[PDB]
Amino acid sequence: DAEFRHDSGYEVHHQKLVFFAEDVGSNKGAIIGLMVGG
C-alpha cells in the first residue's frame, strides 16, 4: 500500500528531481528455498 503525493507551489529552478520509491530490487516477505519434512 503506497500513498504518494507531491503538490507544487511557486518553484523556479534550473533542474528539479522528485524521486519516490518503495521496493526497488527487493524480496520483502518472500519465501525462497524452504524444505519441510512433515
Residue numbers in the entry: 1 to 38
Sentences from the paper on this structure:
We used electron cryo-microscopy (cryo-EM) to determine the structures of Aβ40 filaments from the leptomeninges of individuals with Alzheimer’s disease and cerebral amyloid angiopathy. The ordered core of each protofilament consists of residues D1–G38 and comprises four β-strands (β1–β4) that extend from residues 2–8, 10–13, 15–22 and 34–36, respectively.
There were two main types of filaments, the minority type (type 1) comprising a pair of identical protofilaments and the majority type (type 2) comprising two protofilament pairs running side by side. In type 1 filaments, the individual protofilaments pack against each other with 2-start (pseudo-21) helical symmetry through a large interface, made of residues H14–G37 in an extended conformation. This interface is stabilised by hydrophobic interactions of L17, F19, A21, V24, I32 and M35 from both protofilaments and hydrogen bonds from the polar side chains of H14, Q15 and N27 to the main chain of the opposite molecules. The N-terminal strands β1 and β2 fold back on the opposite side of β3, enclosing a network of electrostatic interactions and hydrogen bonds formed by the polar side chains of H6, S8, E11, H13 and K16, and capped by the interlocking aromatic side chains of F4 and F20. A comparison of our type 1 filament structure at 2.7 Å with the previously reported structure at 4.4 Å revealed differences in the atomic models. Compared to our model, the previously reported model has the same sequence assignment for the N-terminal 23 residues of Aβ40, but the rest of the sequence is misaligned by up to two residues. The all-atom root mean square deviation (r.m.s.d.) between protofilaments from type 1 filaments of sarkosyl and aqueous extractions was 1.1 Å. Minor differences were due to a distinct side chain orientation of Y10.
